[PDB]
Amino acid sequence: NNNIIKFDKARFTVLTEHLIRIEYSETGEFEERMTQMVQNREFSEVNFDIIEKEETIEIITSTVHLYYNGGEFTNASLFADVKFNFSVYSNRWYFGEKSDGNLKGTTRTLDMIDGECPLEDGIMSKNGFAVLADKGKVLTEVGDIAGNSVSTIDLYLFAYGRDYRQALKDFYQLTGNTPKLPRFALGNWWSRYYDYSDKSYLALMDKFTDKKVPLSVSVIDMDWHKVSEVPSRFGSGWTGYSWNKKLFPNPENFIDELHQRKLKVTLNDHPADGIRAFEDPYPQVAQTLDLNTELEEAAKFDFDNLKFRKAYFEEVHGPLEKEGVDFWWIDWQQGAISKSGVDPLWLLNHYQYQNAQKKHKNNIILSRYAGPGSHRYPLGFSGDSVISWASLDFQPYFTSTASNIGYTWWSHDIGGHMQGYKDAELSLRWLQFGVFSPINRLHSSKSEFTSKEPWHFDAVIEQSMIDFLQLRHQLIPYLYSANLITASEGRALVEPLYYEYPMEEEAYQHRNQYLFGEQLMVAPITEKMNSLLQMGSVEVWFPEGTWYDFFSGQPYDGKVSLKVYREITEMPVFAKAGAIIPLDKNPLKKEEIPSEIIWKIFPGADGEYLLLEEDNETKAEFVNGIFTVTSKKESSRKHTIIYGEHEIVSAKRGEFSIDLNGKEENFDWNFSTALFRRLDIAEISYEQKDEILQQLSLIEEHEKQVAFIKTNENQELQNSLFELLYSGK
Amino acid sequence: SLRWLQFGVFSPINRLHSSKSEFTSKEPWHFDAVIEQSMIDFLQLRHQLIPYLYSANLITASEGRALVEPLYYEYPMEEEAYQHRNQYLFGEQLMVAPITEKMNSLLQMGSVEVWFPEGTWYDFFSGQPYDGKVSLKVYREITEMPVFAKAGAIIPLDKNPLKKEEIPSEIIWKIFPGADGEYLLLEEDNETKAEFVNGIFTVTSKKESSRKHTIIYGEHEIVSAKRGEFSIDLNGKEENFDWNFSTALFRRLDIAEISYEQKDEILQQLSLIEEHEKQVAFIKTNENQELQNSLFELLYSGK
Amino acid sequence: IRAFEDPYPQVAQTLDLNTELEEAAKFDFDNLKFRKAYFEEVHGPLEKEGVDFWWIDWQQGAISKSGVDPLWLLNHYQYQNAQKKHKNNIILSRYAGPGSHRYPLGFSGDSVISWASLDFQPYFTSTASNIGYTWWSHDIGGHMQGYKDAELSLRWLQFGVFSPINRLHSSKSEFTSKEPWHFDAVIEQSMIDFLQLRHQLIPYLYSANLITASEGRALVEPLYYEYPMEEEAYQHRNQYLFGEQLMVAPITEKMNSLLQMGSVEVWFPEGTWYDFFSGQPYDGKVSLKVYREITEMPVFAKAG
């Protein structure tokens, strides 16, 4: 109320020093109701100043001057100067105009996208301000669409400068926090647009077990329902709510079998053709909606209609949930048209997410992005990406940049959805990224040739995919703790580099590089390997400090930008001196919570990690070479400790503390072994290999080893040898 | 024509000659003002070198040592002495690596890969230092030639190359710091020994004369036109040449036919990054491979 | 005028600003009180220190509550205010639409340093006469970004000397100075010769200036002003008349290294033409490719 100012037909609410709501009302009434985007305008009071005259008003905070000259909002009447110097003359917002500096957000979908597509703006800007227009409908108390806002213009001016994390936290306070995911969502999902039988699906699930690949989720795509069995007078088989009985003669029994294998089960739902007269639930729906059954009147999709939504959840989904379906894959691609003006995809995500909470605690959906605030309905489903290096090269940037509009749970089809071209190396690189993405869901097109099964590929590719898929389940504790941090504290699992390093120009120059939780920095390789090196590469920016390759221990002295090379089976993931990462020791075990945690410690500095769980909190501290583990509640959990290289403690129960000062701090990784391996795999001349090995062995001074490699005629081989010299310096 | 004259000046004989064409005269003023001035400077340098050449000539005749030696005469067991076909020793004090390839128009500089034997080497003209043993690509403007002297080198130069003198009335003793050395100047009617031993420079002759000696220690003229035999202490004289990384970096970026954004970024990053290994890591990311090599030469010399 | 500025206390008093809340005198050229404080209390003290005229350097858009382009208000009001301190005074500012020739000089701004930019500029300059904006001042040698090429800098200065205004300017780079001695001895001497030639041309330029002001004739004319019915007068975009006695065909392409010369296709109207510098003759009417060393520029005068 002191944070509220009316002037002419406008209303201004100073929510934080850095966040102002700006409204216009012809009627003099302004909007207090929630909207599709905004769930909460309750914020603690803040200091600001006002200069009010007859004709004009200026609102002044620590970061912004907002001016209003009266009348209708125009670029001339409503504008703001930030109190920052990030630019020479892009420090002014004008109503209705775009400025430079927006770091972007996300978009609905990657359907049919081969590589890059345009993104919407987010709330983050290098120049320190962004405007988020609220164009949505108002809600009722219980979250039904109520109609048009009486605030016919309703904007949020963000003026956080480059405090991106606080901008995002306050956005979550305005639009509501992301809910907690359930632990099962963070495991591997299996999916394929393939007409499995109950028998061939269970045989595939048992082959995953036999192949030592853990799964959390069993997706059944659209061939679960009638497709070619649909008479053409009704249109296509794309939408379906009736089991194909040939393939699934006893659905509940099939779902019981997946449940006995400790899998959660989801079905594809294409809702757009509604419930037509051939469907199994049609007689019930027709009775509830008073349809003309002798004229075979369809229950057309209509999520604006309360009776339709009830029949959809109770009489269409209800019978399938009773057969054991755990959650819904909402797969909408049929446009944004409704008589209400609300995007049907928005109505589906909002209502289905709420309905999912009835059957299961912290339940999810799987659906496309439905605009600002739709993070309240995880998980994101990016859809029909084209299978290409260009698509993979876009995806890490896409994923990290989405955190800028608070949409932090994108599930991409890992390996790409459709079209494009076969390349087992592309499939393996894509799975490496997926394992270090918010969700790891293997999925593919209707092709006989696009299965993401590891054993589709040669023995090298298969073993590497199996190792990465196991690593995903090892990461579930770290992922689930970051998930609770997203839900409780408004911090993204995947952050662009500029969230941690806002003032470092290099944090804006590595689009595909990101922080993954608080302990790991990932630089996926998204380019086909150089056949002369038998290695792929990516330019990595190393922030100030000592960094270790998470897998090898190879060290890097920051701050530096350095091209790094990896075999197709290895991924650039880095941890700082002092990093502590927990890993499940038993990733193949079907355990609700890990019976055994490996604490992986990176030497050379202090650190700590807080492991949040369903029913506990465990703190791991590393302070002057003393490692301590405590928990809120006690348990039988057995702790394993790995300090750099060496397993120090194995399966020790309860709370404890152990001194690692005089333990071996150094990893195995050495310049000589790594040099030999890189030269050995290279498809270069044996004379060159022999000369490089002899000269780098005989030349003692680091500066002369570098001078030697600088004479090499292969420019990319120079860069690979320079990486090793830089790490071995 | 200019690169060829640079080599000629550091060859056994410097004879300008050409065909019956109206278009092939080797007159310096045939060419533009830049080329003309550089040819005139090299042609004057040849006459400055006559004392050094004539002493090497008497050594050829009396001792059977060539003025021009392949690297493998001095370094028979070093494989790199067999891999620099155009590199040679010129007398006992100078090592020459002529540039014999058209300049890279993006750098406005020509280059040659130089093998530096064990020891500290100085560019004879600039003082730019090099720590041997190393093989390093070196870049020069078209007006400059890679000629190198070791720490301790003493080269005599005629001070009056334009004078029509039977023997020089005045010798400049050019001394390269950081080690002991000596040079014996053989002449028609004399022998003059120049010795540099724990920072003491001594000149003696077999016979006496009116000859006036000038001394240049690295950068600085220490003595001017002093007659007869003498000895002078250079220990607490300035040993370091002027050549510096910053000036050389600015000059290379300024002449380059590259983008001004690239110039600005390279100048700012190499000025702001303090650790030598990170300056090298920075230049290693450059998309221009030959510009990397040019910047690496400067970092190597400035290390 | 923000609270840290030296004239702020005076402006704040005149505009009744809240100084304890450090209320800015925001730019507002629609406002008579703002314009007066700007000319009297902001420019005024600098003019008393000796500033002769104003470089108005506006790049912040066309937004005003009046709907009048702020650049238009600046050029109209500053040009008028400049006449108080000096007779026939000028500004230096961007083009503000038809009629803004009343407020010379034009300032074209932040061109990219490239052969492509130089290749555009003569056409740009001559074509502007078609909306009566005859005093464009371009940054000679180009403003920013682009790439180093001493030959581009020399060709650009040749055009500049035969342009309405010869203003050397460049970016914040340590590497973009237009000083002649930045370049090698050949380039330096040629730049010095062209810069001296500009001052030799001042009588011819000042007489054409009075003709612009009294008779409405541009200094720089496209060929089709003199030769409206000749198809070739529409096919030499970079060729122009410079006053009434000279025809200029600048070279705006990098030299052919095999010839050590640049070239341009010149249309010679009916009559006998001489290269202004060399006397080399040409019998019109003909279209002919002409070659010059980097130090020489194609400028032609008729018999008489």
Ligand SMILES: OC[C@H]1O[C@H](O)[C@H](O)[C@@H](O)[C@@H]1O
């Ligand atoms: O259900 C069949 C297909 O429908 C749509 O194209 C979905 O986006 C895709 O994920 C699915 O496999």
